[PDB]
A and B are shown apart, each in its own frame.
Chain A
Amino acid sequence: MRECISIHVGQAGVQIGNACWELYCLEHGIQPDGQMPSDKTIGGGDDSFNTFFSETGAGKHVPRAVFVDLEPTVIDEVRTGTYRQLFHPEQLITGKEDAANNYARGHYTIGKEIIDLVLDRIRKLADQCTGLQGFLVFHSFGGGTGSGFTSLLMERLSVDYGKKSKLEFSIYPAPQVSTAVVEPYNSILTTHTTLEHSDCAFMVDNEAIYDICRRNLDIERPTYTNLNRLISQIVSSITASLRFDGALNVDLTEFQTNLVPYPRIHFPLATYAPVISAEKAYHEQLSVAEITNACFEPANQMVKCDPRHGKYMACCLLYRGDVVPKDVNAAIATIKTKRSIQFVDWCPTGFKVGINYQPPTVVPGGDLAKVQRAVCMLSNTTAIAEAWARLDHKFDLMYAKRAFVHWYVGEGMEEGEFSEAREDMAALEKDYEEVGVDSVEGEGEEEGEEY
């Protein structure tokens, strides 16, 4: 009766789609072949799966999801894979050659060729829905398709669907790690495009999560397969309301009203607690308040910028499992009390709150263990201006030499657009800086007797 569309773009995106849908079947009791475990009727009514899967056939549940990369490998490994009977083959879309870490290939000379093919299958999945809520879109900034084909797709999505929300869900590039040299150019050339077209973006970071995997989770040798399974436990908790009833409910069109004080500042960071082995949960009790304070510790944040380095503007709490609303109100009030947990000096009502009755299930035999209660959190903060400044500095150092430029400009893209993308991010640095000002409107600042 209301519905969501998911989109997986580039090898990050696809591999998270191959992690998230796995969880989504268990979270609904669906099987790896889109069946319920049984033919014969049990229980009565919902079947709360309508917002995620179209029901077909003898009660075969088809996930509401389109997949794109311009290499076929990554989608051929789903087409031949474990979940080969869950996904629909029209919705598994492949290219002939990857954008090869080049935005101009991603966005133009290769990416142009299947944009209408992708959009028509998106049309066909929208015409399948009873009430479209909008789009959740998955990529990285590193990728040439994760940048090029995402940005192209969100331009097209605004033609076809106008005001309908478009929420981004993205592997934000790390502060000292990279897997690629040209990552800072693909990182800007997408952002320059999607700020004027998407409604939010919720960041998460490889190196941050690597740190948490080792420090907290006790995982010495973490994989991407842990990474994306921790990332699926994020977006399961951002979509718990759209899957279950709960004491407080938060729709896909809520989060933008809450988290976005001006359309330029639409880039929160996503955090989740607790993240530990079972072996550590036997020396803990994990109260509501405990886990809510754990979502603020700098060592627990899943974007690596330190939240001491700026000021909160906006927050959303997203609880699951054994949580009651008083316990939360007191967790929030005592974090609010801490003016070390500092908010921008204009923000009064900093928090939004969701509460689901249903706990997260985990995948069997794997690295993630059960808890009695859990919290995701989404927070917009001035402290991330150090990582945007990292994406400044990394662009500026190579672009002063015009290094790697000939790959993008050899796809016919222009030096003019390249410079405007950097200029839009020089405006973005002043956008973060102004929200950082304590609403100054004269020649100094003022105070009472004591703070």
Chain B
Amino acid sequence: DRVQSKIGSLDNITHVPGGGNKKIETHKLTFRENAKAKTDHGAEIVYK
């Protein structure tokens, strides 16, 4: 049978992505919108 190690260090290679866990701040999402447009025109406006 040509023989191999009785131990087997490879087993945790079954573990899943990841890598790591979270982050999640406690109540708000400030600047995730990455600074695109949020308004239209601009300068002098209307009148009737």
Interface, chain A (partner B; CB < 8 A):
262, 264-265, 423, 426-428, 430-431, 433-435, 437, 439, 441
Contact A427 B13 (CB under 8 A): no
Interface, chain B (partner A; CB < 8 A):
3-7, 9-10, 13
Contact B7 A262 (CB under 8 A): yes
Q: What's the least CB distance linking B47 to chain A, in Å?
A: 66
Q: What's the least CB distance linking B26 to chain A, in Å?
A: 33
Closest 4 CB pairs between A and B? A430-B5, A434-B5, A426-B3, A427-B6
Q: What's the least CB distance linking A391 to chain B, in Å?
A: 16
Contact A427 B10 (CB under 8 A): no
Q: What's the least CB distance linking A150 to chain B, in Å?
A: 22
Q: What's the least CB distance linking B10 to chain A, in Å?
A: 7
Contact B10 A441 (CB under 8 A): yes
Contact B13 A430 (CB under 8 A): no
Which residues of A are found within 8 Å of B3, using beta-carbon distances?
423, 426-427, 430
Partner of B7, one of A423, A426, A435: A435
- Determine the distance from Cα of A209 to Cα of B9 in the docked complex, in whole angstroms: 35
- Determine the distance from Cα of A265 to Cα of B13 in the docked complex, in whole angstroms: 22
Contact B13 A441 (CB under 8 A): yes
Known: A430-B6, A434-B9. 14 other contacts (CB 8 A): A262-B7, A264-B6, A427-B3, A427-B4, A427-B5, A427-B6, A428-B6, A430-B3, A430-B4, A430-B5, A431-B6, A435-B7, A437-B9, A441-B10
- Determine the distance from Cα of A426 to Cα of B2 in the docked complex, in whole angstroms: 9
Which residues of B are found within 8 Å of A428, using beta-carbon distances?
6
* Closest chain A residue, CB of each to CB of B4: A430
- Determine the distance from Cα of A441 to Cα of B5 in the docked complex, in whole angstroms: 16
Contact A433 B5 (CB under 8 A): yes
Contact B7 A439 (CB under 8 A): no
* Closest chain B residue, CB of each to CB of A428: B6
Which residues of A are found within 8 Å of B5, using beta-carbon distances?
427, 430-431, 433-434
Q: What's the least CB distance linking A434 to chain B, in Å?
A: 4
- Determine the distance from Cα of A439 to Cα of B9 in the docked complex, in whole angstroms: 8
Which residues of B are found within 8 Å of A426, using beta-carbon distances?
3
Q: What's the least CB distance linking A228 to chain B, in Å?
A: 34
Q: What's the least CB distance linking B18 to chain A, in Å?
A: 15
Q: What's the least CB distance linking A166 to chain B, in Å?
A: 20
Q: What's the least CB distance linking A344 to chain B, in Å?
A: 11
Which residues of B are found within 8 Å of A437, using beta-carbon distances?
9
Which residues of B are found within 8 Å of A439, using beta-carbon distances?
9
- Determine the distance from Cα of A304 to Cα of B30 in the docked complex, in whole angstroms: 65
- Determine the distance from Cα of A439 to Cα of B5 in the docked complex, in whole angstroms: 14
Contact A431 B9 (CB under 8 A): no
Which residues of A are found within 8 Å of B4, using beta-carbon distances?
427, 430
Q: What's the least CB distance linking B1 to chain A, in Å?
A: 8
* Closest chain B residue, CB of each to CB of A422: B3
Q: What's the least CB distance linking A428 to chain B, in Å?
A: 8
Which residues of A are found within 8 Å of B7, using beta-carbon distances?
262, 264-265, 431, 434-435
Q: What's the least CB distance linking B5 to chain A, in Å?
A: 4
* Closest chain B residue, CB of each to CB of A434: B5
* Closest chain A residue, CB of each to CB of B7: A262
* Closest chain B residue, CB of each to CB of A425: B3
* Closest chain B residue, CB of each to CB of A431: B5
- Determine the distance from Cα of A431 to Cα of B4 in the docked complex, in whole angstroms: 8
Which residues of A are found within 8 Å of B13, using beta-carbon distances?
441
- Determine the distance from Cα of A431 to Cα of B7 in the docked complex, in whole angstroms: 6
- Determine the distance from Cα of A146 to Cα of B20 in the docked complex, in whole angstroms: 52
Which residues of B are found within 8 Å of A262, using beta-carbon distances?
7
- Determine the distance from Cα of A428 to Cα of B13 in the docked complex, in whole angstroms: 23
- Determine the distance from Cα of A411 to Cα of B4 in the docked complex, in whole angstroms: 31
- Determine the distance from Cα of A426 to Cα of B1 in the docked complex, in whole angstroms: 11
* Closest chain B residue, CB of each to CB of A424: B6
Q: What's the least CB distance linking A357 to chain B, in Å?
A: 39
Which residues of A are found within 8 Å of B9, using beta-carbon distances?
434-435, 437, 439
Q: What's the least CB distance linking A420 to chain B, in Å?
A: 11
Q: What's the least CB distance linking A69 to chain B, in Å?
A: 33
- Determine the distance from Cα of A369 to Cα of B5 in the docked complex, in whole angstroms: 45
Q: What's the least CB distance linking A370 to chain B, in Å?
A: 44
28 A-B residue pairs with Cβ-Cβ distance under 8 Å, sorted by A, are A262-B7, A264-B6, A264-B7, A265-B7, A423-B3, A426-B3, A427-B3, A427-B4, A427-B5, A427-B6, A428-B6, A430-B3, A430-B4, A430-B5, A430-B6, A431-B5, A431-B6, A431-B7, A433-B5, A434-B5, A434-B7, A434-B9, A435-B7, A435-B9, A437-B9, A439-B9, A441-B10, A441-B13
- Determine the distance from Cα of A448 to Cα of B7 in the docked complex, in whole angstroms: 29
